[PDB]
Amino acid sequence: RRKSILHTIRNSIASGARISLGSGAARVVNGPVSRNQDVFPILDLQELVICLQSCDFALATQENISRPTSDYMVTLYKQIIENFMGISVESLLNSSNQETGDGHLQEENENIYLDTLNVLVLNKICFKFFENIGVQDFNMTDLYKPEAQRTQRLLSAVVNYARFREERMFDCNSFILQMESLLGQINKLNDEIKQLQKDFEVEVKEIEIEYSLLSGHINKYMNEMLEYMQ
Amino acid sequence: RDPRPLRDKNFQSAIQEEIYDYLKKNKFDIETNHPISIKFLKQPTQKGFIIIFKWLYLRLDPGYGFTKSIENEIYQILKNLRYPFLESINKSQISAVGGSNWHKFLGMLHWMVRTNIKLDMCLNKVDRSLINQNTQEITILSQPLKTLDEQDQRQERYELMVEKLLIDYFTESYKSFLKLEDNYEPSMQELKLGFEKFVHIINTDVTSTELKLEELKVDLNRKRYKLHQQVIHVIDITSKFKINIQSSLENSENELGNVIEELRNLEFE
């Protein structure tokens, strides 16, 4: 994918936005222990929607968070996971589905299971992603029976993670710059080598054209002569 | 529809043995103190049915916490799981599991056990897939072959590799951030090792390319030497041909002029 959160943040640094909008990080401590909500904001709409769209997530719209429905959060979650975590959900499901492992008598109609398993795998993927962002509470309901509270909670954790990425970006350029240096060096070497080889072969072809047509012309006029005179 | 021959008792015996084996192999009896035996599967209680359904679905979706009214949630779970035989089962029957329609309930429990086993297999498959398609990039990037629109693909692969490293760093760092201790040195040194290996690979590639360009320069000079020799030879032969043809034409023209003049002298008479 041509996009990411890292390169987009760099491009934003180069622009006048500064750090791609937002207020850096958030870490809520909690001693309500009679209650317990994990360490991240539940920052509300607008702030949430603005941050989501700042990360180049066009599907983010206020009408979805406060009134979510199935098949909408699914696309957004796939998009977020593939951007931050740099994977392909479709490739993973395809890998799970493939065959030449099991083989079994009553499994000649695995279709009745197949669909369900894909669902589960999707869900479980999200689980781990959200298990890495302070929430242990993804379950099926978030995907297929969404409610605004859990949606805003998960998205708040997500935006907090994104802001953390932005903050810690400075430790990364020491590597991005060297990567780009080496890649640009390779590209320049390849361009030079291609130019040299193309130049030589074009010169050879042009000379061949010259001399072939020279031979043709000499034969042309010699034979045109000798046909009239003999 | 439900093609399963649920009412057959040999089929039921097989299903009950499989369910018992799965629950024992995964310690249902220990995690929940309610024990399980095949006789129970033949003569189920309502509470034991609820416990088994809960245990199975939580093995299938740990993040879910029960709520509501289990009659209202079992249907919704099956609806979200798109249980293909959902339309064949009525919700009210959930109230009395051990009654007339116990066969469908035992059938869905077998469905869930099979789904659990297959889910575990799928997760192992995807984990191995991740570890393998991580190493596919490096193994591809250390083979010499091809040049077709792919050098761009090579740079893309390098970028993706480094991006993976960075994502690992960020995820671990955010783990430390949420766990309010802030020790980023371990994440940093793991990132440093990864990027060092990246640098070694890409610099090996760069050195290969530099040597290849130098060898190309040598070869092109050697070939242009021969090209120059051939061009000089062709020009030489062309000039010799031009002078010879010009001389032959001049001689023919002069002799024909002489003959024509002599013929004029002869005709005047």
Numbering used by the authors:
A (entry chain B): 254 to 270, 290 to 305, 1002 to 1153, 1407 to 1451
B (entry chain A): 114 to 318, 621 to 684
Article excerpt on this structure:
The bridge between centromere-associated kinetochore assemblies and spindle microtubules is the Ndc80 complex (Ndc80c), a heterotetramer, conserved from yeast to mammals, with globular elements at both ends of an approximately 600 Å long, largely α-helical coiled-coil shaft. Closely paired calponin homology (CH) domains of Ndc80 and Nuf2 at one end, augmented by a flexible, N-terminal extension of Ndc80, form a microtubule-attachment module. The coiled-coil shaft of Ndc80 : Nuf2 has two specializations—a kink or hinge at about 160 Å from the globular end and a so-called ‘loop’ at about 240 Å. At least three interactions involve subunits of the DASH/Dam1 complex (Dam1c, consisting of Ask1, Dad1, Dad2, Dad3, Dad4, Dam1, Duo1, Hsk3, Spc19 and Spc34), which coordinates end-on attachment of multiple Ndc80c rods around the splayed plus end of a kinetochore microtubule.
The predicted structure of the docked segment suggested that a fusion construct of part of the Dam1 C terminus (residues 252–305) with the Nuf2 N terminus, combined with a deletion of residues between the two conserved stretches (residues 271–289), might ensure high local concentration and increase the likelihood of obtaining informative crystals. We therefore made the inferred Ndc80 : Dam1-Nuf2 fusion construct as part of the dwarf-Ndc80c, expressed and purified the recombinant protein, and obtained crystals in space group P3212 (a = b = 130.0 Å, c = 216.3 Å). The Spc24-Scp25 component had dissociated during crystallization, and only the Ndc80 : Dam1-Nuf2 heterodimer was present in the crystals. Dam1 binds Ndc80 : Nuf2 with an α-helical segment, which rests in a cleft between the coiled-coil and the globular head domains, and an extended segment, which runs along the N terminus of Nuf2, but also contacts Ndc80. A salt bridge between Dam1 Arg299 and Ndc80 Asp295, both conserved across budding yeasts, anchors the C-terminal extended segment of the Dam1 fragment. The Dam1 sequence in the structure also includes three serines (residues 257, 265 and 292), the first and third conserved among budding yeasts and the second largely so, that are potential Ipl1 targets for regulating Ndc80c binding. The structure suggests that phosphorylation of serines 257 and 265 would substantially weaken the contact. The side chain of Ser257 is close to conserved Ndc80 glutamate 276 and its phosphorylation would result in electrostatic repulsion. We observed that density for the Dam1 segment fused to the second copy of the Ndc80 : Nuf2 head in the asymmetric unit was much weaker than the first, and its appearance was of insufficient clarity to build a molecular model. Thus, the crystal packing prevented uniform ordering of the Dam1 segment at position 2.
